[PDB]
Amino acid sequence: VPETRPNHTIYINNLNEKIKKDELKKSLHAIFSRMGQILDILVSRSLKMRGQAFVIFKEVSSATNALRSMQGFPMYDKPMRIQYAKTDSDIIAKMK
Ligand code: NA
């Protein structure tokens, strides 16, 4: 079951795996900066992290609006799947 506690960070998957890391981050920043101020965007090249990304917002209200408003938003011909990131995700701690 996905995380139900609102997190500053949203977890995104089903991203187009053809796009390189830096371009994916620039596009995500363009789409999600409209939900609120972004502190960081985490993308890994690892094999188990492809098609996935984290967006860390300065305020939970921005993350919540992103989750409710950008769910299924089509990018690179693929609808994004968004969840609240796991509370104190081990992945975020290492990546940030
Ligand atoms: Na919606």
Chain breaks in the chain (C to N over 2.5 A) after: none
Number of domains in the chain: 1
CA–CA separation, 43 vs 46, rounded Å? 9
CA–CA separation, 66 vs 80, rounded Å? 11
Q: How was this structure determined?
A: X-ray
Closest CA to 87 of 1, 32, 9: 9
CA pseudo-torsion sign 83, 86, 91, 96:
positive
CA–CA separation, 46 vs 37, rounded Å? 27
Please give the resolution of this entry in Å, rounded to 1 decimal: 2.2
CA of 86 from ligand 1 middle (Å) equals: 21
CA–CA separation, 2 vs 18, rounded Å? 26
CA pseudo-torsion sign 20, 30, 71, 39:
positive
CA of 34 from ligand 1 middle (Å) equals: 15
| Alpha-carbon 48 to chain mean position | 15
Q: Which domain holds residue 26?
A: 1-96
Which residues are within 5 Å of ligand 1 (an ion), measured at CB?
Answer: 71
Question: In this structure, are strands 78-79 and 53-57 parallel, antiparallel, or unpaired?
Answer: unpaired
